[PDB]
Design a protein around this ligand. Structure first.
Ligand SMILES: OC[C@@H](Cc1ccccn1)Nc1ncnc2[nH]ccc12
Ligand SMILES: [Cl-]
Length: 167
């Protein structure tokens, strides 16, 4: 039993809700919140920009030190950093950004990072400003993640479409 509330159950381990991941994380304070990161951990917009804003830019400061030490992530890769005031940890995961021409096949590799954590609050990878089809992202999530994932979809219209079209 966990403290996530109001989710629709899609499979044994995947749940979905219309919610602002920022407000969800603040309410639940999960062990792991997933960020929709880019390889430079520049949290300018989308989910990343919103999560960073909620940390008063502390996420960006920590991320800049991470990059200065380690260099950029790989597309499909991840790193674990602090969750600041939002969660214990933030798993920064880089899905492919279609608006950069990146290979959509890497979306499965991106979701594989979730399997290293027993429970996660997450957005749909490569959705929104990363330009992938959210219906496809949900399918890859369900077919790749085996740990317990609580998906937050900010857009109510998109949420209803994701639920109604789910196979
Ligand atoms: O896929 C992730 C995208 C989905 C999206 C957003 C808007 C319009 C269309 N798609 N973004 C988010 N998801 C959950 N919480 C969020 N908080 C801020 C941004 C955000
Ligand atoms: Cl977005």
């Amino acid at each position: 039993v966990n403290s996530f509330s109001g989710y629709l159950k899609l499979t044994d381990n995947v749940y979905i809700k219309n919610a602002d991941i920022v407000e969800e994380a603040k309410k639940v304070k999960p062990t792991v919140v997933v960020n929709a990161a880019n390889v430079y951990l520049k949290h300018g917009g989308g989910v990343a920009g919103a999560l960073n804003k909620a940390t008063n830019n502390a996420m960006q400061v920590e991320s800049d030190d991470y990059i200065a030490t380690n260099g950029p992530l790989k597309v499909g890769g991840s790193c674990v950093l602090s969750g600041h005031n939002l969660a214990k940890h933030c798993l920064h995961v880089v899905g492919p950004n279609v608006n950069k021409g990146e290979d959509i096949q890497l979306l499965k590799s991106a979701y594989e990072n979730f399997n290293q954590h027993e429970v996660l609050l997450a957005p749909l990878l490569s959705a929104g400003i990363f330009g992938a089809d959210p219906i496809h992202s949900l399918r890859v999530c369900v077919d790749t993640v085996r740990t317990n994932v609580y998906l937050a979809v900010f857009d109510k219209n998109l949420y209803d479409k994701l639920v109604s079209s789910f196979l």
